[PDB]
Amino acid sequence: VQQKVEVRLKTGLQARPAALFVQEANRFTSDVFLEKDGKKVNAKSIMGLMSLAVSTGTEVTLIAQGEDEQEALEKLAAYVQEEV
């Protein structure tokens, strides 16, 4: 089941946090995504990170279409815009 919460990627998933992002979204047994204002990709995947997630400042919706749909999507999107 897929849900996603769009957040501004203040992380812009460069590596430090975002590797952990991918890792968490990935922990989540969900087809996770990150959709830059709709431009979605597998959040836990290369293009999810490097492509969409890496777009620091984009209001990208972090999806999780898995066992931890809601869980994954919300905390992962949260993560992008929650710290620095």
UniProtKB/Swiss-Prot annotation:
Coiled coil residues, start to end: none
What positions are modified (Phosphoserine)? S45
NCBIfam families xrefs: PRK13782.1, PTS_HPr_family
By sequence similarity, the record places it as follows: Belongs to the HPr family.
Q: How does it assemble?
A: Mixture of monomers and homodimers. Interacts with CcpA as a monomer.
Q: What does this protein do?
A: Along with seryl-phosphorylated HPr, phosphorylated Crh is implicated in carbon catabolite repression (CCR) of levanase, inositol dehydrogenase, and beta-xylosidase. Exerts its effect on CCR by interacting with CcpA.
- Protein name per UniProt: HPr-like protein Crh
Name the gene for this chain: crh
